[PDB]
Design a protein around this ligand. Structure first.
Ligand SMILES: C=CCOc1cccc2c1-c1c(c3c(n1C(C)C)CCCC3=O)C2=O
Ligand SMILES: [Cl-]
Length: 332
């Protein structure tokens, strides 16, 4: 017998109840703007499949960000565009403003609202305890929204969280790996960056769901409260699961594998070994203790579970005591 099937615990059937066109991105027709509306100002960075520029919309003098795509399959471009349009206006989701066809690369360029980001390798060292709770809450708003809209991001990590700290403004970016959740669908496990890959990806369990994003969120939270980046520091995808197991223990890993009848790549047998589940205090020291509290550790523990079905949902996460002060302040 093969692996046991799985279904999302929440938002299971939201796409089924939508018109086909909502999620059937292969049939999406792209609406193009005018490439001449935009003049590039300077290069801001790069993606795996893109180069990113600051630009000016010369018809209204608005600053925008332009993501010029490298060669990608057209259906993957349609997928990113369709997801961005479906999610437009949702809390802390980057706003796709336009789509143009670049004359030089002959490739598409996605035009986004401008965000004045502070690089997290500089920002995260300055955040307070309250700042971490605040920005985690804002990320959760974006994730609960996209999950409720039938979409999993699949690439949650600090590089994909833009923060204008001066204005306490956050946007979740780079929807190029995001996918629609359909119950029973088996997904590509070659997604997300190594340090943020969930155990389901590392053991090749394909019937995963929104809860993948919650593992990644827990990896980010751990790196921020312990000031250890990355938290799970694997040398490759196999060693990545070893690093997780040295913290979460091997017992719950093998229980997870047994529960879903997952056939474990034989290369894992010689490297996983046997490891106890460690206490989070092992990562607390004088340089990070001001960011670590009983509430933070309780919240973290409920995100970082092997069994994707047992992780907090984004909505459950937002109701955790860790956020009580944030929730109370946002009410006034
Ligand atoms: C300091 C620069 C601010 O950066 C912005 C601002 C607004 C919108 C986006 C970005 C952006 C996007 C994407 C990428 N950046 C950056 C990290 C270089 C990297 C590759 C993937 C990607 O999509 C935006 O969508
Ligand atoms: Cl659009």
């Amino acid at each position: 017998s093969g692996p046991v099937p799985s279904r999302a615990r929440v938002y299971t059937d939201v796409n089924t109840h939508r018109p086909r066109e909502y999620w059937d991105y292969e049939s999406h027709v792209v609406e193009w703007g005018n490439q001449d509306d935009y003049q590039l100002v300077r290069k801001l960075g790069r993606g795996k499949y893109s180069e990113v520029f600051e630009a000016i919309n010369i018809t209204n003098n608005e600053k925008v960000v332009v993501k010029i795509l490298k060669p990608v399959k057209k259906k993957k471009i349609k997928r990113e565009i369709k997801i961005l349009e479906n999610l437009r206006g949702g809390p802390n989701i980057i706003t796709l403003a336009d789509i143009v066809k670049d004359p030089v690369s002959r490739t598409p360029a996605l035009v986004f609202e401008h965000v004045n980001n502070t690089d997290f390798k500089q920002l995260y060292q300055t955040l307070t305890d309250y700042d971490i709770r605040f920005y985690m809450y804002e990320i959760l708003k974006a994730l609960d929204y996209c999950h409720s809209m039938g979409i999993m991001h699949r690439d949650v990590k600090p590089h994909n969280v833009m923060i204008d700290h001066e204005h306490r403004k956050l946007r979740l970016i780079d929807w190029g790996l995001a996918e629609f959740y359909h119950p029973g669908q088996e997904y590509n496990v070659r997604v997300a960056s190594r340090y943020f890959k969930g155990p389901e990806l590392l053991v090749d369990y394909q019937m995963y769901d929104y809860s993948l994003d919650m593992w990644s969120l827990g990896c980010m939270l751990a790196s921020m409260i312990f000031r250890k980046e990355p938290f799970f520091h694997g040398h490759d995808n196999y060693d990545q699961l070893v690093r997780i197991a040295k913290v979460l223990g091997t017992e719950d890993l093998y229980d997870y594998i047994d529960k879903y009848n997952i056939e474990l790549d034989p290369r894992f047998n010689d490297i996983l070994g046997r490891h106890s589940r460690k206490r989070w205090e092992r990562f607390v020291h004088s340089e990070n203790q001001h960011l670590v509290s009983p509430e933070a550790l309780d919240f973290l523990d409920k995100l970082l579970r092997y069994d994707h079905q047992s992780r907090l949902t984004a909505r459950e996460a937002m109701e955790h005591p860790y956020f009580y002060t944030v929730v109370k302040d946002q009410a006034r």
